[PDB]
Every structure is written in structure tokens, then in C-alpha cells.
Design a binder for these strands. Structure first.
Lengths: 79, 149, 56, 48, 147, 337, 106
RNA sequence: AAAUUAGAGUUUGGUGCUGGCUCAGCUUUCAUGCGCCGAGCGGUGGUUUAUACACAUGCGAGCUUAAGGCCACGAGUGCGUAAUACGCGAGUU
RNA sequence: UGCUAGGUGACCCAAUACGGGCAUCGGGCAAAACUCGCGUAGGAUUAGCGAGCUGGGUCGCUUUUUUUUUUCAGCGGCCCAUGGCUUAUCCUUAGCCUGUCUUAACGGUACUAGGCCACGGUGGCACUGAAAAGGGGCCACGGUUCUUAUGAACCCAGCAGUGUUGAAUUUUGGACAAUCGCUUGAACGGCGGAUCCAGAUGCUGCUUACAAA
């Protein structure tokens, strides 16, 4: 998955990972990545996008990223 | 998709069939014992049975006309079983002799002997003496010395 | 298997995907660790081992 | 590979050469002895 | 790497080579033999028609010349007429000289004696080759004596 | 329609056996000239191109011409060094008219690489005044030297190491070039290839130790060698970046020994001992022998390195240069016991 | 094997009704509303329908049910069942559609 | 612990062949009649299957410090192409 | 060549203290583009290929840039060797493969999603870009409208929707919140008929009597 392909296309990348954002009864997030090619791709300069960087930091195999520079009232009812 | 992916699995297994069949002869290259070109087998989409040309070449180089003499042997077995003849008489080869010793060894038959159509023996050809010869021939040249066995 | 099934006896998802609850880490069972919100590495809670074993 | 070649190939081939050459010496003892004396006696009696 | 017969050399610095490659068909479980033709660069024009050559991929030189000749394995022997007349001269010289030296010993008797002793010298030679290779042994198998 | 007039203009310069004359254009680009000189193999053809197109050659054409001269030196069998030398003399006034007025640092570095490439082993020479003046003209402006590549600057250093006689290392123009290049490269030390650091170390060792301004120049090249040699020492062993070749660390160690012998225990010699003593048969002997001379001048004893080089010392044969290697390695061995 | 058999094996994927042209149902305008007498041992006057169909070709159609209301210039929907009792006719007029609707009290 | 072969009726005074037709199998449609349209959680599927026919109207690539800097990725169809296509396998300048 | 991280700035912006853009360098891995080995619908009522139909030389084939060593093709012009193929050409069908259904398997054939190619009403061509055009540029055609007739405007095989034909084909819906893309150094910023959610509609898996805590 480079910049060219879409989300669901056939990709040379092996895994975005075993992933399940749905909460599951306790320890609510999923099991994380399978491994050993994730470090190769992030080593090779393949970029992460914003939330995979948050998820990789949150799993603690990478350090986390601070998101907010300022606060203005976000609307939670947009959905 | 496994049809596409499982093509070349037997390709790397064919190469040691070449090397352990023919030391010093080299996708694989197959020298059938016929015209001088070694005959080539290699990849496609539809997966291949690698070791048909190597396996066939080892067969025909060790035992020449393996297919025709094997089918002739087993065809004559089928012949006289369905015709009630209890004797089975073949144009012999290396294959017919060796695999007749095989099926006598396993006891599919009870025995074999070389025979000769003795009416058209000459004034003196060589003639098969069963007693004075040792009991079991084991090569073609001893069984192609004479005339029309 | 019978003793395990006998001794068994949130889902709001709607996800705007927020990273609220802690995270657990062919897939290599048993799971490796639990990653919390606070950057802490911890082994599995007992209940989490139970529902990992229910998941299979 | 060398064990297979020098301990199988040359001696099994050697078996094949000496077996067909014992056969050839059989055929050649035939074509000298019986053939030669038979045909020189036939040509002798035919010219007589 | 292909080892295949040449079929054409009428062609500048380029020989047309045919190779017997065997393709599978899945429908009938039978290997079908086809022969494809390739155009290959040679450099010395030592390939007479009937030579068995080794071609290999190199840099493409043309639209359709794509391999290069590595080695000619078995040379095709060719018709030289003056050399053929020389073989006529040597061969009937050998026949007439042997019949004159031989010519009671009808000449068949002498030649068949020479072929018998030549076969005997051969059999003694390959038997001693088997003797130096194996030692004193029954000709049961060399696979038994490979231990 | 004026092709025959163009052809007569071509005929008025080059005799009638050339294929260039059918190919000739007055309105040629230098791009096509670099490729057309890149298409030839014989010195007759570059001579034909020179007398056709002396008017349109900028510095890239001279650089490609010198590479094609080296190419003919190793592939054209009928080589005449005298005709090559007079043609190389003809190359001078075109440079002084054009390339010393419009030479960017890239073009001039390419030419000097090409000339040192001609003088490389597998004797043609130019005047050294042109080499030094090309060196100062390529570096006369600071800004393009700030944006220059490390490959360019160490290539310029290898050119100046190969072209110059040893009497001219004390010339002030080479020192001005070294001033400018140190003032550029010491800020972008971490943008350097280790091969480029190898040639930087060798060239500052070659040119450095050759009144207050000159001793300040020696002290400044001392800080260049100590910082740059520590940069190679840091780059060896740090497996996260490309590991430098043990040849390059060995030869930069020899540069350290050269500047220590001329000016008169770093980690560089220790890591050089490691990368040699693990990989001796990839090393050529003479670079390692020079490293043994550096071990001699530092007085340090690298044990498994010296026993490994004892094993390497036995493994040479007998013959003139090889016995000279054995003799000087035996001498430095007795210097270290 | 035998190479004549190797070359001995896409044909015409033949629609067994060639008037519906692979489709199940084609409409059309009734050219003539007529009856006929059938093959023996049948002798009841069966009512048929020649229709200029959708595909520009014509074929005869069986008219079912207790009478019908079809005249000239009348649209029908034609189905794929045949009537055996006269040869060459393969079409059935389905009822529950257009000007040919269902009979009274079926 | 490898999960792997259904026939019957139809031809003739009857019997057996000879091959064909049909029905029972599975899958498939905004198929076509007749009947319900209680409400929710979902999967999915439409190659407007066809017309590569003609398009009313509205919207789909705008962002950003007048000026300039970035917008070839996504969606649709299969005309043409029986081979610079596509797939598979080796090596790349 | 294209991305991401570094290191540099006689530059620009921000800064009660320091980070961004902007230029250049180089480490990482990467695409791209070409080449060849094979596979491939039938037709003799297609039998010679109306052609450079294949090869060799010569040029043109729009860049030098780290140590011993380094840089395709008939693509066009010229000679030239006279050969190259013979299911060769020519016709017509057809996007191709995995798929899906079935069969016990071998096989035989309408989809799912997705891989690649092709095309954008028809045909020709160019700019820029490293690489070329589905709402980018020019011309000719064919349509659709209007002119005071001289000429201009537009091209749903994008979404909804209209019309013919059809047995049959859906709402002129909401929304950037989730992705993912493009963009921007504030701002949970801006946009996206991709998508995500809702509709109509075949197939399906899955519940369904009310009352009351």
C-alpha cells in the first residue's frame, strides 16, 4: 500500500495487522500486529499515516505522538 | 490461485532426479535415448508434472523400450488369462527378463524359461540346453546370442 | 473442553475510532502482552486470558 | 556426486562393455570358426 | 541455457536454432512435444548445419535475435569431395593391399582370425580394466562392490 | 537543401574517411556532443570530433574526451602516447578561453577526475599551473561549494592527489583550495560517505604538513584530521549506517600514520585492527603493511591483528615487490618486536 | 496421446428454443388470431396465435384457457412452453398480463 | 487426525440392444403469474445484465499565502485487442 | 525518478528564546520502464505472406559524476547479406487470468470482491511533467441548442435522474465524523457522489404474543 493504491486494493504490503477496533468484553482492543516485516517497512521509509502512528505508539512498540496544539469546542454531534 | 502458485514445486525436485540419474548432464534438461538434442521442460501457468521427462529418460536409458515391452508383457498376460492359455510367451528383452524374474520372485507366476522355436534352428546353431546351462539367465546378451527365442 | 465450557457458566462500538481502552499484542497464540493507555507493559489479566480462550 | 559417479557409473558401464564384448567374442568365434571353415569348404566343393 | 540443434546459417552473424521443448497440456495428461525456433548470435561462424550448440541469453542485438552462442558440442561432419576421393584412394588401397598380402587361406579365414584375436585382445583389455577397477570378483554387480 | 554546403564545411576540416561528416550539424547541443564522444572508441574519431567541433566544447566535453582517451588506452590497441600528448596540449587554450570563465564546480571537478583517471594504473601529463588554477576557479565562490556533494569534493581531492608533483604541495593555491574545502566540509561532516571521508583524510594527510599563517594551516589540518578520523572511528562499528570498507579504514589509518610521521592512541587504529583481523584476504597486502607502519609510529601493539598479519606474511611468495613487502613488514615487525 | 485426438478437443452453446433467443420471455404484437385442426388422434380445434415478436421474427403460440379476448393489433407476453399436438410450434401465451388476461371464474 | 460416483418413464405383439427426449438434483434473475407487505439487527448482490444509445437539471477538485505554490490517486465501462495484452518463471543496463 | 526520516544554511517566516517553510547534500528502501523463456478462439469455402516480409555494417539515435571495469531496440537515413516465416498471413468471435456454479474427480461454463490491460462520443497531435491526460490545450468529424445565420456553446462507459428498446432495471438522500486520498506549519482545519451511512430491490442468516421490573 503506497500513496497510489486504495484501502482495499491488492497490496505488496503483507499486513496492516490483525486488527479489531471494536471493544471485545475486556482488554477491549485487538491483538496487535503479527511481526518482523512491520519493522522492515517502517525502517525502509514507508510512511505511517496519522492513526496507524497513534496505534503503533499506543501499543508501545513505538513512542507516542502528541496531537493537540490548541483547544476550540469540537462538536461531538456531527454524526 | 494455488494452481498458479504450486507450479514450480516439483521443478527443483526434478534437478536431483537428473543428477542422481545422470551424473554429468546439464528449467531442466532431459536426454531421452534417441536423437542428440536434450529435450527441455520448464514453467507455464498450468502446473506441470515435473519428473515425467526425467523419470521417462531414466527409464528408457536404463531399460530401453520400457513402455512398449512392459505393455507387451502385461498385454500378453491379459491375453492368455482371458483366453485360458496357461503359458505366456514373449519376445524377450532386458525388461521382459528382469521383470519376469520380478514377478516370479513375488510369485505372480510360478516360473519362466527361455525357449526357442526349435523347428527353424539350423544344422548347428547354438541351442538352449536347460540342464547344462545354469538355471536362470540374467542379461539380454546371453538371451540374444541365439536365433528367435 | 467440558470443564472449560462449564466454567464459563463493553459492546457499544459505534466507532469513531478513539484509543480509549487498553490494547493486547498466522497469529502467534498465546497473546504477547497487554499494552495500556499509559504506555505501560503488563502481562495478561485473568479475565482477558479467559476471553482469549473463549475467542478461539 | 563423485561417490555416485566413480563408484557406480564407470563400473556399471564397464559391466555393460564387458558383457557385450563377451557376447561379441562369442559371435566372432562363431563367424571365424564355423562360418569360415563351412564357407571355404563350400567354395572348395563348388569350384570342384 | 539451451542445448539445441542449428537449422539455418544462411544468415549474417546469426544462426537460427531450433530447440525441442516439451509443454504440458492439462486436458489429456500427455506431454506434447513442440519445437520453437530462436535466432542467436554467433561470432566466428563455426556452426555448420547439424552442429549441436549452446545458446544463452545476452544483451539483445536486434528485434528478434536474443541469445548468443556459447559452445558447439558435437561437430557436424561435412561432405568434402576431394577428401572423399582421398578416402576412396586410401580405402581401396587398404583393401587391395590386404588381399594381396593375404592372397589354403581364403582371405575370409585370415580376416576372421584377425577379428577373433582383435576381439580377444579387446576382451582381455576391458577384463583387465575391470580387474584394476574391482579386483578378483564375480561380475554380480559393481553396485555390490561399491562398498 | 544546404546539406552540401554543410558537407563542404565539414570537408574543409576533416578528411573524407570520417563518419562524423554525414552526422555534422552547426547547431549542435553539447548534450549530443557528450553522447557522440561517448559513442566512439578510437583516437582517430576523437581527433575528427576535435577538429570538427573545437568551437562548441565546454568543460563537460573535455571531461568526456579524457574518459574516452582512457577508454581507448585500455581498448584501442593502436595507441600512440605522443599523439595523445600533443592533443592533450591542444586541449589547454580552449580551457583557458572558456572553462576559466564559465566553469562551475561540477564541470571542473569532472575534468580533473577524468585527468587523474587518465593517470591511473590498470606517462600522460598536463601543466600543473592549469590544474591549480582550475582548482581555485572551481572553488572561488563559497555558495556552490556549500551546496556541493561529498563525492565531488573527495573526487577533487583524489584528482589533486594524483596529478600534482610533490614539490608543489606547498603551493599557496592548493592551500587556498584546502582552506575553502575545510570551511565547507567541516559543517557537513555527517553528510559524508565513508569513501569520501577516506579520500578527505588521505588528501589532507598528503597536503597538510607541506610563517604564522602556515603553522595555523598545519594546526587547522590537524583539527581536520582529528575530527574526520574520529568521524570514521564513530562510523565504524555503528551498524545502523553502512559499514565502511576495511580497505578504506586501513588506508585512512595509513593517512594518520603519514601525518603523524610528517608532523612529528586513537580508537581508529583499534577498529582498523578489528576490521582487518576479521577480513584479511579481502585486504590487499600493502595497505595492511602501511597500517603496520602506523602501528609502529604509534607504538601500540594489536595482538590478534599482528598474529593474523604474521599468517598473512607467511602466505606471500618470493619475488621482487612481494619480497619488498616481506622485508618492510619484517622491519616493522622488528620495530614492534 | 494420439495427436488427432489431442487436437480433437467453444462450440455453439445452442439455445434449444431459437425464437426467444436465450431469453425466457419476449413480448410482441399478435399478427393473426386463428385456430387449426391438430394431428390425429387429436381432433379438437386448438386456438393458436401468430405473433410478430420482440426480436423481429415470427413463430406460432398456443392460446390457453377457456376462450380469450385477443384480436388484431394486440400485445401479449409469450412464454416458452410448446404445444405438441401440431408440429413446429413451441410457444405459450402466459395469462395474467396485458390485453390477454385471465378467464372468468377459473 | 486425508470426508471420495442415485436413477426412472419413454420405441415394441412382447424380450434384448441403439442412441435421443423428459422428470426428479444444485445454482440463478427488480423473470411472469397468484399472497402477504408487522418491526429490527445484518450480510451481501446487482457489470441500467444489453446501448462504447441521446442526455434536461443539480452535484462530483479544490486547497493556500490580485499574484503565485500543490491537484496523473480514486469511479465507471469492455469499443478495440487472439497479442508491446494477461498469467507464470529467470535475469535486469 | 518518487517518497520518507537525517545534516547544512551570509535565505524567508515564527520566537519573552527557538520551530517551521524554502534551497542543497547524502543514508534507507521503493516504484517506474524495457527485454526475453512458455502458454493461449475457431475457419482451408484463409495458401503463400502486395513487404523490409528477418538479419549485418554505417550514422542519427539530445549529459561527465567515487578507486582495476562499465552504459538497449530498426525507432528514422544510407548501403547492403538476400533472406525471414510457413496456423505464415487474412477473416470473424472475444478484454485476460484468478474467480463463482456444478461434477466424486478430471473437466464445463453468467456474477462475487479484487489482480492487470484497454477506452473515455470519433480520429489526429502537442505543451508541461520523471512518467499524460475520464469534468487539461489545439484541429477535423458526428450529434444537441440558438443566431439578427455570421458563428459560438456543449459531449454522464462519474453519482442521482430523464427518454427509447427491454420481461426487467434504484433515491435528482445525508455527511466528512470513521478510514483513505489531496491540501494546509494554528485551529479534531478545507474538500472528495472514493467511501461511510441510510433508501428502493433479487438472494440469503436471524429474530419476532402482548403486558409489567
Amino acid at each position: 500500500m503506497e500513496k497510489r493504491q486504495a484501502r482495499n486494493s491488492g497490496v505488496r504490503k503483507e499486513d496492516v495487522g490483525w486488527w479489531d477496533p471494536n471493544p471485545a468484553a475486556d482488554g477491549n482492543m485487538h491483538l496487535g500486529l503479527n511481526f518482523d516485516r512491520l519493522k522492515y517497512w517502517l525502517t525502509a521509509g514507508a510512511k505511517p499515516t496519522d492513526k496507524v502512528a497513534e496505534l503503533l505508539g499506543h501499543a508501545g512498540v513505538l513512542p507516542k505522538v502528541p496531537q493537540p496544539p490548541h483547544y476550540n469546542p469540537r462538536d461531538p454531534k456531527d454524526d | 490461485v494455488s494452481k498458479l502458485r504450486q507450479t514450480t514445486a516439483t521443478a527443483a525436485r526434478a534437478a536431483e532426479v537428473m543428477r542422481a540419474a545422470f551424473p554429468g548432464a546439464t528449467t531442466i534438461a532431459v536426454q531421452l535415448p534417441r536423437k542428440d538434442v536434450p529435450t527441455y521442460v520448464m514453467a507455464n501457468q498450468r502446473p506441470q508434472p515435473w519428473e515425467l521427462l526425467p523419470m521417462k529418460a531414466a527409464a528408457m536409458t536404463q531399460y530401453p523400450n520400457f513402455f512398449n515391452n512392459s505393455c507387451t508383457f502385461f498385454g500378453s498376460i491379459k491375453r492368455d488369462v482371458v483366453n485360458g492359455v496357461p503359458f505366456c510367451l514373449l519376445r524377450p528383452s532386458r525388461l521382459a527378463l528382469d521383470m519376469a524374474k520380478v514377478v516370479r520372485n513375488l510369485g505372480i507366476v510360478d516360473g519362466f524359461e527361455v525357449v526357442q522355436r526349435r523347428s527353424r534352428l539350423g544344422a548347428h546353431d547354438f541351442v538352449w540346453l536347460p540342464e547344462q546351462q545354469p538355471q536362470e539367465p540374467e542379461h539380454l546378451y546371453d538371451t540374444s546370442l541365439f536365433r528367435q527365442r | 473442553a467440558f470443564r472449560r465450557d462449564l466454567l464459563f457458566n463493553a459492546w457499544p462500538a459505534n466507532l469513531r475510532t478513539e484509543l480509549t481502552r487498553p490494547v493486547v499484542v498466522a497469529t502467534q497464540y498465546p497473546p504477547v502482552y497487554v499494552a495500556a493507555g499509559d504506555g505501560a507493559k503488563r502481562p495478561l489479566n485473568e479475565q482477558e486470558k479467559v476471553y482469549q480462550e473463549r475467542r478461539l | 556426486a563423485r561417490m555416485a559417479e566413480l563408484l557406480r557409473e564407470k563400473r556399471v558401464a564397464t559391466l555393460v562393455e564387458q558383457v557385450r564384448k563377451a557376447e561379441l567374442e562369442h559371435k566372432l568365434a562363431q563367424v571365424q570358426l564355423q562360418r569360415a571353415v563351412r564357407r571355404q569348404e563350400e567354395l572348395h566343393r563348388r569350384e570342384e | 541455457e539451451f542445448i539445441g540443434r542449428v537449422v539455418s546459417n544462411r544468415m549474417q552473424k546469426t544462426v537460427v536454432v531450433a530447440v525441442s521443448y516439451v509443454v504440458w497440456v492439462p486436458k489429456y495428461k500427455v506431454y506434447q512435444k513442440r519445437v520453437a525456433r530462436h535466432k542467436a548470435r554467433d561470432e566466428s561462424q563455426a556452426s555448420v548445419i547439424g552442429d549441436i550448440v549452446r545458446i544463452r541469453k545476452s544483451r539483445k542485438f536486434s528485434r528478434e535475435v536474443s541469445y548468443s552462442v556459447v559452445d558447439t558440442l558435437r561437430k557436424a561432419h561435412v561432405y568434402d569431395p576431394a577428401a572423399a576421393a582421398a578416402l576412396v584412394a586410401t580405402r581401396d588401397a587398404a583393401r587391395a593391399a590386404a588381399a594381396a598380402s593375404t592372397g589354403r587361406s581364403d582371405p575370409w579365414v585370415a580376416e576372421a582370425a584377425r577379428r577373433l584375436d582383435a576381439s580377444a585382445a579387446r576382451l582381455a583389455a576391458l577384463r583387465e580394466l575391470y580387474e584394476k577397477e574391482v579386483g578378483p570378483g564375480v561380475p554380480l554387480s559393481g553396485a555390490v562392490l561399491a562398498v | 537543401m544546404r546539406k552540401r554546403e554543410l558537407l563542404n564545411e565539414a570537408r574543409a576540416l576533416v578528411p573524407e574517411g570520417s563518419g562524423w561528416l554525414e552526422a555534422y550539424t552547426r547547431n549542435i547541443s553539447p548534450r549530443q556532443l557528450t553522447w557522440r564522444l561517448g559513442k566512439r572508441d578510437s583516437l582517430a574519431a576523437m581527433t575528427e570530433g576535435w577538429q570538427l567541433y573545437q568551437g562548441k566544447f565546454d568543460t563537460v566535453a573535455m571531461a568526456a574526451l579524457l574518459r574516452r582517451l582512457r577508454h581507448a588506452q585500455l581498448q584501442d590497441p593502436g595507441f600512440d602516447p605522443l599523439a595523445a600528448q600533443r592533443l592533450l596540449d591542444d586541449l589547454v587554450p580552449r580551457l583557458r578561453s572558456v572553462g576559466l570563465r564559465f566553469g562551475k564546480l561540477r564541470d571542473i571537478t569532472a575534468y580533473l577526475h577524468a585527468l587523474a583517471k587518465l593517470r591511473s594504473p590498470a606517462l600522460l601529463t598536463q601543466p600543473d599551473a592549469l590544474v591549480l588554477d582550475l582548482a581555485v576557479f572551481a572553488t572561488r565562490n563559497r555558495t556552490e561549494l556549500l551546496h556541493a556533494s561529498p563525492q565531488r569534493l573527495a573526487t577533487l581531492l583524489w584528482a589533486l592527489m594524483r596529478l600534482l608533483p610533490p614539490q608543489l604541495y606547498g603551493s599557496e593555491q592548493l592551500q587556498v583550495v584546502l582552506d575553502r574545502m575545510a570551511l565547507a566540509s567541516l559543517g557537513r561532516l555527517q553528510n559524508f560517505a565513508p569513501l569520501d571521508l577516506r579520500w578527505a583524510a588521505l588528501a589532507f594527510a598528503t597536503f597538510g604538513p607541506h610563517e604564522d599563517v602556515t603553522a595555523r594551516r598545519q594546526s587547522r589540518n590537524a583539527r581536520v584530521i582529528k575530527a574526520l578520523c574520529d568521524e570514521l572511528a564513530a562510523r565504524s562499528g555503528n551498524l545502523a549506517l553502512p559499514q565502511p570498507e576495511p580497505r578504506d579504514l586501513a588506508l585512512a589509518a595509513h593517512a594518520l600514520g603519514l601525518v603523524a610521521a610528517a608532523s612529528s592512541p586513537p580508537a581508529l587504529l583499534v577498529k582498523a585492527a578489528g576490521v582487518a583481523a576479521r577480513s584479511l584476504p579481502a585486504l590487499s597486502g600493502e595497505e595492511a603493511v602501511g597500517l603496520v607502519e602506523t602501528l609502529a609510529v604509534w607504538g601500540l601493539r594489536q595482538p590478534a591483528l599482528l598474529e593474523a598479519l604474521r599468517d598473512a606474511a607467511g602466505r606471500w611468495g618470493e619475488g621482487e615487490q612481494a619480497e619488498a613487502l616481506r622485508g618492510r613488514l619484517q622491519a616493522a615487525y622488528t620495530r614492534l618486536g | 496421446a494420439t495427436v488427432g485426438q489431442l487436437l480433437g478437443g467453444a462450440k455453439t452453446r445452442k439455445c434449444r428454443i431459437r425464437q426467444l433467443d436465450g431469453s425466457p420471455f419476449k413480448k410482441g404484437i399478435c399478427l393473426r388470431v386463428y385456430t387449426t385442426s391438430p394431428k390425429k388422434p387429436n381432433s379438437a380445434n386448438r386456438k393458436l396465435a401468430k405473433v410478430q415478436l420482440s426480436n423481429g421474427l415470427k413463430a406460432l403460440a398456443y392460446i390457453p384457457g377457456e376462450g380469450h379476448n385477443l384480436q388484431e393489433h394486440s400485445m401479449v407476453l409469450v412464454s416458452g412452453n410448446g404445444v405438441r399436438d401440431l408440429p413446429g410450434v413451441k410457444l405459450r401465451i402466459v395469462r395474467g398480463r396485458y390485453d390477454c388476461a385471465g378467464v372468468k371464474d377459473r
